[PDB]
Write an enzyme that holds these catalytic residues in place. Structure first.
Site, PDB file in Angstrom:
ATOM      1  N   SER A  96      43.213  33.369  52.481  1.00 32.12           N
ATOM      2  CA  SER A  96      42.468  34.128  51.487  1.00 32.12           C
ATOM      3  C   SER A  96      42.049  33.271  50.298  1.00 32.12           C
ATOM      4  O   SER A  96      41.238  32.355  50.429  1.00 32.12           O
ATOM      5  CB  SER A  96      43.317  35.325  51.037  1.00 32.12           C
ATOM      6  N   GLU A 132      40.911  43.208  57.662  1.00 30.69           N
ATOM      7  CA  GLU A 132      40.993  42.618  56.336  1.00 30.69           C
ATOM      8  C   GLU A 132      40.914  43.642  55.194  1.00 30.69           C
ATOM      9  O   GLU A 132      41.620  43.511  54.187  1.00 30.69           O
ATOM     10  CB  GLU A 132      39.879  41.573  56.165  1.00 30.69           C
ATOM     11  N   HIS A 136      45.371  41.997  56.173  1.00 25.21           N
ATOM     12  CA  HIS A 136      44.993  40.768  55.493  1.00 25.21           C
ATOM     13  C   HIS A 136      46.269  40.063  55.073  1.00 25.21           C
ATOM     14  O   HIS A 136      47.080  40.626  54.341  1.00 25.21           O
ATOM     15  CB  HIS A 136      44.155  41.102  54.251  1.00 25.21           C
TER      16      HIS A 136
HETATM   17  C1  LIG Z   1      41.681  38.765  48.190  1.00 25.40           C
HETATM   18  O1  LIG Z   1      43.027  38.712  48.702  1.00 25.40           O
HETATM   19  C2  LIG Z   1      44.124  39.276  48.023  1.00 25.40           C
HETATM   20  C3  LIG Z   1      44.035  39.969  46.759  1.00 25.40           C
HETATM   21  C4  LIG Z   1      45.202  40.514  46.140  1.00 25.40           C
HETATM   22  C5  LIG Z   1      46.482  40.395  46.750  1.00 25.40           C
HETATM   23  C6  LIG Z   1      46.538  39.701  48.001  1.00 25.40           C
HETATM   24  C7  LIG Z   1      45.403  39.161  48.616  1.00 25.40           C
HETATM   25  O2  LIG Z   1      45.623  38.511  49.827  1.00 25.40           O
HETATM   26  C8  LIG Z   1      46.932  39.005  50.226  1.00 25.40           C
HETATM   27  C9  LIG Z   1      47.731  37.988  51.104  1.00 25.40           C
HETATM   28  C10 LIG Z   1      48.026  36.671  50.311  1.00 25.40           C
HETATM   29  O3  LIG Z   1      46.810  35.923  50.105  1.00 25.40           O
HETATM   30  C11 LIG Z   1      48.640  36.988  48.952  1.00 25.40           C
HETATM   31  C12 LIG Z   1      48.490  38.187  48.326  1.00 25.40           C
HETATM   32  C13 LIG Z   1      47.710  39.403  48.896  1.00 25.40           C
HETATM   33  C14 LIG Z   1      48.579  40.675  49.215  1.00 25.40           C
HETATM   34  C15 LIG Z   1      49.375  41.284  48.023  1.00 25.40           C
HETATM   35  N1  LIG Z   1      48.494  41.943  46.982  1.00 25.40           N
HETATM   36  C16 LIG Z   1      49.323  42.859  46.135  1.00 25.40           C
HETATM   37  C17 LIG Z   1      47.763  40.965  46.110  1.00 25.40           C
END
Ligand SMILES: COc1ccc2c3c1O[C@H]1C[C@@H](O)C=C[C@@]31CCN(C)C2
Ligand SMILES: COc1ccc2c3c1O[C@H]1C[C@@H](O)C=C[C@@]31CCN(C)C2
EC number: 3.1.1.7
Lengths: 527, 527
Positions: free
Chosen positions: A197, A324, A437
């Protein structure tokens, strides 16, 4: 001693860590930059001054100051991404997992954590490099960088806060690995950077930025790319959100200097509390402080760069997960709940669509809706819920990555594309969320190998298989030693990543992506 | 005598015609208006002055002056729509097929022929009423009207050529049936008007026009509706095309009077030769002189009328064929040939799309193309060819009819919707054309009953079945005496019309029609 290493920065003393009935060495909390504290906040990272004596690197370092998720207190499914260490502005450290006996010149893999650029920790349980390092015999490094305003407040024109410093933080760690990974038995000429991500988008941002290319061999991008709608903003918008953040704290906004000074006097938590009040729209999958197209780190627009081939040409292995969007709808779209099948209704679907494409006008929203609505069963709550999942993932992850992949493959030296669509048998999140995701990570980091984790035999197998692809690819620029086809601008082949017999497909989500990547933008622009 | 009938207009002498091993009476060429010749050309129809003596009505009358198709000389598949009688400006006649013995007060069906408003003949072989009249015991009447500029030149504001006179011609025949169908054994209180395409759109135009409603009980519309993109134009455009037609003939364009006089001095063929040089665009499925939204015949916009319920509320039975576009692509889209599978290429598909939606801008064309393109096999020539067939039919026939049907059903007293998708075993046109526009007629008129015509047993059966629906519906306002469901704004049920066990479906082409009826128009308008 196997646990003592001498680097250009100082002596580092690691610790022997057990792994799958064996052991390896780990050097955690190695400083790679001067603490960005004090008047240094918002400023670019300074190189970490060398130290005399032995630096104790046997324990994880602090985590960077970030917004903590409390949407489901005590829920493992969410707390697993939360900082598991005291947060601090002094968080610029890296961790290295080195096989035992110490290698001489072996493949190096550098992990860049995600978290929307506003959160993230290298110390997360799912980021435990010991399993990858041990199993694939690679020197696994996991860096850290400033997230939020601390690492991304962008007041372009100013040197006190130019923005993008969080990216510079990642780079300085990359610089430190290039300069010292050898003394750990790692080959600084075969370093692969990889992240999920925000980390995957970061990775690709290093592929594009001229000042970052020479610091690594190849790259792996998981559910993220440099051109993601949420990965970056304009300097105008960055300036807009910076001032608005000052406004939220009753700051003197008469001059950048006035503004920065105020923000620097505020306690970290002071900024994290109002951090979300600066987004320009009511939206889903959007974050306040992200990388800015400044003209420095990013010479020009990301689109122009991808078009003119202005970027590091090498091998890239990337992919996306099936669902996702699910994670983001569960947190901000009405109708979604963690404990219900979250069957969505037309009124809530329309509300989701609106939250998903904030920049879209009415015609645009009509376009999106028509594209994802089955008008022969438009009241189907499962279709509405699923269609909304696709809208969020396609637009925010899958399609932007398919653009980059197709743009890159034109000048690159090897592209490998996967589609991870396996649901962990032990996932704790609702089933309507599907292949969430960030849930491919545990397989990439081989968690399915630890029995105590309750994974199925097949999942351990898939993990091992995936882990070999990543390493083998990191080592040779090819995942293969059953052949995972290379992606070509012509055939666009990719494979499925799950516990079932490998299958190859073509044109991953073309229909929906031709709409997201070509039509919608043309429409929104025309209108 | 059974073959002599006295009407308010004069005595009419018919002829005994044989039918399926039997006989009936036919009165062909009965005048219903004064010959629109001379200074009367373009003018509204005057009532046919009564005649002394017996009028010889045993032979078909002349056909109206129309553009003759010579795209495939001698080809039955096309000449079958060509005038089979001397063309003449003196063509306003009607034909009646009356059962023997003469009925007393039985159901009446009035057929309105199509032909894009520029061509058409009631005397066509496929329009032989003897089979319907005999089999269903109905008094079948087939009228005639002025087509082309002769019946549709619209110089609004002027009384010499107001336009729509071709519609008035249909109405005056309807007026004559209302006044004289009794003396033929027909019940002027149970008259159903029906027509295909231009006739079907005409039929619906009578449902909307206040001055035409009282002249008939119910209506049947085949592959055509009043709101079809090609069935009508604005008075501005009508005036535009009228002047342009004068320009094509080197006419004095200083005044409507000057213009009309010139056009009136021209031989019929003089106008038919340049008739096509007046369309505003390079297009497919568009014709020069069609009905004008004048404010008289059509009080307001057809959309507003359908919306406010401003129209004759009764029962309607209507439908479409599977491949409406095929006939029009074969005649004007590059890549289509009568003797080849007409596999279309991207370049030709894009050219078709352009020809199909002339009023569309670039964004619009992109919209259409994205909607009908399988981007996972976009080079499929059969998909390209088929998708182009759907684009022409959906936009020009299927979708406009689904709009009308849904608008009407809201105030109507009964709607029955069919989807004719059967290909005649003896069709002479290429198979890629499929169920061609206008090929349900032969079944409606029971041609599959005449052995000499080489139809399969099933087709004769389907014809008989369909013929009973039409008549039974004409007689009772219901096709049923296996139950053809009624169409409701809620369930939107319709049935399939072919040689297979009746099947009921819902929302006939919703996806494509939501795009054509709602999205595209909103887009084209926004942009
Ligand atoms: C755009 O991607 C994200 C935007 C916010 C968050 C995450 C995201 O990708 C998820 C997986 C990893 O990358 C880390 C945090 C995430 C899962 C936990 N949440 C609470 C925060
Ligand atoms: C919009 O519909 C049409 C436009 C032009 C033509 C026809 C149409 O409908 C077809 C079937 C019937 O209505 C009469 C003529 C048609 C077939 C023969 N061609 C040559 C002329």
């Amino acid at each position: 001693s196997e646990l003592l290493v001498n680097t250009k920065s100082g002596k580092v003393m690691g610790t022997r860590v057990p792994v799958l009935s064996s052991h390896i060495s780990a050097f955690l909390g190695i400083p790679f930059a001067e603490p960005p504290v004090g008047n240094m906040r918002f400023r670019r990272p300074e190189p970490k001054k060398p130290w005399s004596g032995v630096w104790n690197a046997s324990t994880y370092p602090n985590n960077c100051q970030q917004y903590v998720d409390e949407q489901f207190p005590g829920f493992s499914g969410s707390e697993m991404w939360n900082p598991n260490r005291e947060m601090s502005e002094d968080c610029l450290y890296l961790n290295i997992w080195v096989p035992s006996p110490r290698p001489k010149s072996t493949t190096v893999m550098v992990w860049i954590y995600g978290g929307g650029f506003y959160s993230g920790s290298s110390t997360l349980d799912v980021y435990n490099g010991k399993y990858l390092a041990y199993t694939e015999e690679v020197v696994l490094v996991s860096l850290s960088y400033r997230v939020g305003a601390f690492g991304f407040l962008a007041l372009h024109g100013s040197q006190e806060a130019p923005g993008n410093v969080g990216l510079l933080d990642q780079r300085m760690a990359l610089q430190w690995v290039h300069d010292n990974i050898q003394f750990f038995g790692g080959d600084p000429k075969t370093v692969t950077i990889f992240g999920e991500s925000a980390g995957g988008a970061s990775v690709g941002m290093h592929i594009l930025s001229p000042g970052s290319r020479d610091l690594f061999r190849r790259a792996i991008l998981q559910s993220g790319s440099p051109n993601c709608p949420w990965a970056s903003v304009s300097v105008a918008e960055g300036r807009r959100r910076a001032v608005e953040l000052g406004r939220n704290l009753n700051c003197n906004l008469n001059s950048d200097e006035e503004l920065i000074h105020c923000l620097r006097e505020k306690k970290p938590q002071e900024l994290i509390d109002v951090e979300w009040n600066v987004l320009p729209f009511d939206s889903i999958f959007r974050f306040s402080f992200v990388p800015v197209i400044d003209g420095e780190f990013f010479p020009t627009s990301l689109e122009s760069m991808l078009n003119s081939g202005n970027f590091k040409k090498t091998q890239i292995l990337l992919g996306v997960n099936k669902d996702e969007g699910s994670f983001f709808l569960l947190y901000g779209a009405p109708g979604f709940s963690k404990d219900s099948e979250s069957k969505i209704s037309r009124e809530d679907f329309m509300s989701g669509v609106k939250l998903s494409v904030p920049h879209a006008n009415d015609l645009g929203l009509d376009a999106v809706t028509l594209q994802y609505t089955d008008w022969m069963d438009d009241n189907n709550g499962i279709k509405n819920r699923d269609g909304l999942d696709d809208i969020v993932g396609d637009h925010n992850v899958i399609c932007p990555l398919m653009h980059f992949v197709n743009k890159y493959t034109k000048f690159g030296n090897g592209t490998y594309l996967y589609f991870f669509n396996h649901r962990a048998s032990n996932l704790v999140w609702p089933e309507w969320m599907g292949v969430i995701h960030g849930y491919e990570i545990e397989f990439v980091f081989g968690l399915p190998l630890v029995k105590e984790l309750n994974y199925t035999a097949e999942e351990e197998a898939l993990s091992r298989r995936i882990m070999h692809y990543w390493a083998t690819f990191a080592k040779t620029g090819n995942p293969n030693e059953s052949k995972w086809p290379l992606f070509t601008t012509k055939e666009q082949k990719f494979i499925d990543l799950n516990t079932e017999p490998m299958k190859v497909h073509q044109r991953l989500r073309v229909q929906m992506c031709v709409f997201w990547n070509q039509f919608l933008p043309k429409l929104l622009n025309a209108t």
